[model samples]
Target: MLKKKQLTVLDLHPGAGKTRRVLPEIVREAIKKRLRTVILAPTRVVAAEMEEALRGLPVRYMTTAVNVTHSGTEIVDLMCHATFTSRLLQPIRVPNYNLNIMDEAHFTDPSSIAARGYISTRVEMGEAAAIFMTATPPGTRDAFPDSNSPIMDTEVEVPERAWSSGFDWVTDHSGKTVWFVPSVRNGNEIAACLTKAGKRVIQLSRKTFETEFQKTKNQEWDFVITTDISEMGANFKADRVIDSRRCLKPVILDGERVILAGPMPVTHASAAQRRGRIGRNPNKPGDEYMYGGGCAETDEGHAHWLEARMLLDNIYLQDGLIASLYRPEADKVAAIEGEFKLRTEQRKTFVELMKRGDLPVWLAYQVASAGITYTDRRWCFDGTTNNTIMEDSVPAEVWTKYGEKRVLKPRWMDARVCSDHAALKSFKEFAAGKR
Candidate 1:
């Protein structure tokens, strides 16, 4: 509920402090209004970090106002002992009319399954107020629908004069700018080359480069060569950002320097977000630049065709606006549609069970009642059931596949067979005529 602020291109930076300051106030105000917030992010780590930060505050800490669900903590008391099946039946026990914040707003495309569950939940939470958060917000030309209203568009601007002057000073009078690309060839050779050139080169890739990145630390290396992962979450400003990812899928690139790396076809959403990074600075000249080979490469055209075909299969492209964005490849898109159909079919069965009063709600409720106890396979039947229970036996490839005991709770046998009368005979007998 903090008043919405407009963010210019220059105001955006990778530092967490700005986010820390703004988000806390927003959470406080939302708490006062009793709105349920859903803060969505592209990665779970960012979500967990935000959750940790909010946990220490009075509104979020003292009260049971917060609940987290993600890969790291499988036990998100959102109802049920297991995964997907449980969440579908029972909504998490969060207070009604609370806020729901979606961290990554750019991923609203119907084809993106990762956001489907979250979107479905938000839609179902009729009264809950929802907020969408994203650093690299997508532009008007996206596969997904447009945003309704940006509550806060605070200008995260960067001043160009401060950095451009420095770049000019370092460049040769002949205007031959020395560019750097990571040596993926060998570590020793790269070091020797930089040493021989007497130029200060900064390595920033997952390999030969430094392994860790501090959020607030800034190093002004004449040239920095980094991998795609570095494109994530960092707010590094430099003389230029060169995106070499020529594939159809647009990779994110953020830096102060003019963004030069891309053949990332004009059609991808990733390309739009990258361009947004540079255009965000309203005060600065709209100095964003994009370079592409624009070769006779028909691959991008094919990718676009595939995107279109997907929309057609989903019946989304019938509307002219969305149809224009589809990529080629009927077979590839058909496979993707096939997966969507499978998921829909699985969910349909649950919905049918609910309508027919065949849900066996008691069994599901009992399973959840056991809490974290269900992790131990022995507790599944407790001695009352006649079903053939799978023992907690070790598998043949324990070291290779099951070496790590990931789930503290015991893994249950697949549920499809468990729902069958024959499979449930033992448990049903214990219930006798009740079931």
Candidate 2:
């Protein structure tokens, strides 16, 4: 694609040939150029897949440091995330491998993100090139000022799929299926219902999943119901992937601590992995029937806002008024100040923007709802400028998603919360011309 030697994130789906085509091309290029390359898969299982995809190609596999007897003629090394972390402990992996291909690179892995921090330094410095390929690319689009995402990616249309009501499909179905239950409570209950329907089903637990995996592949059962995320690597070509209705995560109330229930809205990182379980057969793609669950597709403007925010956090690992375009006017000065810098002029302009309410309602809620000063923030919880921002400035829908529904409500309440009073006061003052 003639891309720059930077950290490029490839957003692709399961059938996009990420492993078959992309992996080989990169491996060949590195070998052709004599560039040392390391392919880091999220697990040994995924690394095993890479070994298969890269078959006939000479590449070394390293499960542990001991596996490498000599740095032989092999230009490619299939590395697992765990071994990568271990090798990273000695601080030895980064500089040596100039070309890094991270398959299934979901940035949600805390340790991996930390590892990425180390790798990103070299990537941004142009000392290394990291090709992060994942079906669920994290906030890649908004990370840069350029038009391109860190490669490319989207959504697939499931044919008129609103047919099921309650557990209707479970009562009547054919072909092999994976019922992805979030909890055993739901799994066993569903299993019981399907048992009543005389459907061939087996409820596998953590210990049993690996063993049962083989039996299910023979298509002996109609449905394999479980909570284990085993399909991340295993080729479980099922007719459909079904999710439990109670597939829920916690929600937040107004205060930082208040918790309730919220639906696990689908996103590329998590849901794509689920849906990909189906449609794996290259010879014949299949269907998936998991309820999209409260997935309100990310609004275009809002999506950009989030990606920019994600880009800021992913790169700098911080969230302040980034000197970036995640926020409309606030980040413009950042562009002039250069990547991570901010000028007094922008800060001053930002303050005026805040005072005049040019700042988005969400930003306003952020300022008024959070801060450190006991005198000011004490009142922020309810009345005063905080209340005014909540009442007049921000809308119910905005606060629900941005503030109230977010557990650790106080943290988001704080300035991501934990906003320093004086520090926040300084920004607030600039925002108010009080300083």
Candidate 3:
């Protein structure tokens, strides 16, 4: 068991089975202490995998529904569970868990509303100890504001593999393989080309990616062509991994347009994770092939091709940390105003409202542009009445009627505001008032 209110950060290399090895012990410790625990996973696929891995432990595993039955126990013990980050942001009553273990913690960007909600809720509950585990540590930053947390780094021995350039190397190999590409279109094209060449292939997209991956875990196929979605937490033994080197995309940076190129930019710490997919089962040795080229006909296409070529050359020549073509930049105020296309002084007023946490992040521009304020007491967005009420000034009857549903928290309130534009408009009117 952990001796103090310590924050442990596990920086394990890719395919090191951090979850497989670290989670069980933490859950057992929580059980021993008679404390509840909640483990957060980045995606549903990872969450399900975590739940399945911890099946043998004496902890109840649950998803959206907090209550569950396991091992013939009516009473839930050691609420050792797994859930998506999205679910944890909801204003539901989470069983008071003293320990919070966040898996794939790098996915939790500290500036995001989801991260704010998760951290604030943990603080509000007075969580004693927390653990963060990830392959990439996102550069020594802690999700919480705690300054005394301890970070532990671990690396597993990964076998050295031969590297090549192109898909032709796979023609002779009859073992299962995986090809990583940048986009869905590229994945489809690669899958079709391999199929026409008489090779068995499966194309995985965002919707079908998770389920298809799980189904083929134990089985074998000639090849699997996928986008960056499968870059993390996927364990499969393959004879070869084809790196198409097709990592280049256009993004706005510093108020100027430029093509961001590199495996890091395209996959976001996924290049190493994808490479780790191979060389997993020590019994099966594997090879890596890095290929690059441009097939586009237009000028824009050629630009991207040139950028991709430059990045590939650097990947082969320099160390992993390469400087970007241009420095990153963002105007948060301008970006927020652009979301709803607000006007001059109206944008200023909206930002002011947002500064006070009265305006929900989702409804700021819409409400601000509409001239809605706290003193108005009521307003309409897209011609619909919002049911939001000021928490500090609302009546007991309103509280009794709306309860937690109508309640609003500072900065981060409801998840729907982020997901549902209609709900965002409704709440924009609901919370109109001055405190």
Q: Least accurate stretch of 10 residues (summed lDDT) in model 2? A: 143-152
Least well predicted 10-residue stretch by lDDT in candidate 3? 324-333
Q: Per-residue lDDT tens digits of candidate 3, residues 120-213?
A: 3344334456666766554432211211112111222211122233435556677777777766545666677677778777776544665677
Candidate 1, residues 47-160, lDDT tens digits: the string is 444566566443322112235323431211121111222232333343332554444333432222223233333334343344444443433333121221111122222211
Residue pairs with backbone atoms closer than 3 Å in model 2 (clashes): 9-150, 252-405, 256-409, 256-410, 351-431, 411-417, 414-417
311-388 per-residue lDDT for model 2 (tens digits):
233222224322233121222122232232323333333233333433322333344333322123222334333222
How many pairs collide in each candidate, listed in order? 59, 7, 5
Who is ahead in lDDT, 1 or 2?
2
Models sorted by lDDT, best on top: 2, 3, 1
lDDT of 2 at 84: 65
Better of 1 and 2 by TM-score: 2
Candidate 1: lDDT over CA atoms?
0.32
Index of the highest-lDDT prediction = 2
Cα RMSD, each candidate: 17.1, 13.7, 16.3
TM-score of 1: 0.39
